[PDB]
Amino acid sequence: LHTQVGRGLLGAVVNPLGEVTDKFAVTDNSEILYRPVDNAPPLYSERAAIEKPFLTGIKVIDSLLTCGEGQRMGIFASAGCGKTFLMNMLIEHSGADIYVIGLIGERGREVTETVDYLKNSEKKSRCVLVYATSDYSSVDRCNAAYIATAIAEFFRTEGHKVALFIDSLTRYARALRDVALAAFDSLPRLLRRPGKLKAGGSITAFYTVLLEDDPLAEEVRSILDGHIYLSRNLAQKGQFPAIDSLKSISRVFTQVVDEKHRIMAAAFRELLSEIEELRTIIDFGEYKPGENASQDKIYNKISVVESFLKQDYRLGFTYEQTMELIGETIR
């Protein structure tokens, strides 16, 4: 019911009991205080309006799915669609003050992969990892999500721009459903706790949701402020990040970017729609070059559009670089 918080947890690996079992980085700060893990979300008049963008360094996200400070964003994918690689890029190329990762329901080797990744990370000195392996009970797995949230909430009250990752909301939902055997709706209460405080910092949250052969993922689609969809089709095609920008949305998009940006984004999204229409025409074998000038114009832009959407996972792009690239693509 209470947990460790503080700068002394930066670089530490926290188990579902709130104890430090490993370290991926050592910090000079030893600040350790204790806060309740269950805490009420901020009432609406303490919450600020999401106005400032949360830059991620990922081109398609920063251009067409621009995240905001205090926003809650879902990552819908079917493992393995590169959900872990996408969150690695989100931690690498964003500019948050502090990163809090919560690995819920991972089987056991998976957690060691991320701790090894944090050991060689640029952001190692600003990360806190909370984990709950598949061997822990369901009670411990739900406490993992709330320990991670409470750790992020303390940094937000200190004024820090925090980024919280919950992987995954689905295995967290299984654990809550399993706990329900003891004689369902703690999920929304958690998913409200992020946000930007008028009197403090912010928590920008990323929740992963595992898809494939969910009925209630449509309601968690209804509670968040946008969702990023990783298409198994595009991953097999060889395009990473395999984000389907046409099936993704950031509901705060028009509030966090200027009009210059809105016009460029709208033009790119229709260019993508025309590209997909031409893909259906090509697969039908009814496309012959020189027959239709508009189809030839769109065809010759397929390559530059694919080049803009792709991104080396070791590379990050500033906002100016992103808008410059998408501008040349629309020309």
Secondary structure in 3-state letters for 90-133: HHHHCCCCEEEEEEECCCCHHHHHHHHHHHCCCCHHHEEEEEEC
Closest CA to 32 of 49, 10, 16, 17: 10
Orientation angle between helical segments 138-157 and 169-179, nearest 10 degrees: 130
Per the CB < 8 A criterion, the answer to whether 304 and 310 are in contact is no
Ramachandran region, residue 238 (left: φ > 0; alpha: ψ -120 to 50; beta: rest): left
Which among 242, 225, 224, 241 is positioned nearest to 233, based on CA atoms? 242
Task: Tell me whether the omega of the peptide bond preceding residue 241 falls within 30 degrees of 0, making it cis.
Answer: yes
User: Is 54 annotated as contributing to ligand binding?
Assistant: no
Is the separation of the CB atoms in 73 and 226 below 8 Å?
yes
Residue 72, helix vs strand vs coil? strand
Contact in structure between 232 and 247 (CB atoms under 8 Å) = no
83 is in an annotated binding site: yes
23 backbone φψ class: left, alpha, beta (φ>0; ψ -120 to 50)? beta
Question: What values do phi and psi take at 53, rounded to 5?
Answer: -75, 150
Burial environment of residue 98 by CB neighbours within 10 A (0 to 12, 13 to 18, 19 or more): buried
**Structure tokens, 197:** 């405080």
The CA distance from 79 to 213, in Å, is: 12
Q: Rounded to 5 degrees, what are φ and ψ at 7?
A: -65, -20
**21 marked as part of a ligand binding site:** no
Angle between helices 319-330 and 302-309 (to 10 degrees): 170
The answer to whether 24 touches 13, Cβ cutoff 8 Å, is: yes
Place of tokens 């095609």: 237
Q: Residue 46 contacts by C-beta under 8 Å, 6 or more apart in sequence?
A: 197, 198, 199
Strand segments (E) across the chain: 2-5, 12-14, 20-23, 33-36, 53-54, 67-68, 72-77, 98-104, 127-132, 161-167, 195-196, 202-210, 226-229, 249-250
Q: Residue 84 in contact with residue 215, Cβ under 8 Å?
A: no
80 is in an annotated binding site: yes
Which helix (H) or strand (E) is 180 found in, with range? none
CA distances from 43 to 40, 194, 320 (A): 8, 12, 35
Give the C-alpha separation, 3 to 321, whole Å: 41
* Residue 84 known to bind ligand: yes
- Give 3-state DSSP helix, strand, coil % of the chain, rounded to 5: 45, 20, 35
The separation between CA 191 and the C-alpha centre of its own chain, rounded to angstroms, equals 13
Buried b (16+ CB within 10 A) or exposed e, 112-131: eebbebbeebebbebbbbbb
The Cα 307–Cα 315 span in angstroms is 14
**Distance of alpha carbon 151 from alpha carbon 36, whole angstroms:** 10
Please identify which residue in the block is written with the tokens 């490993």.
22
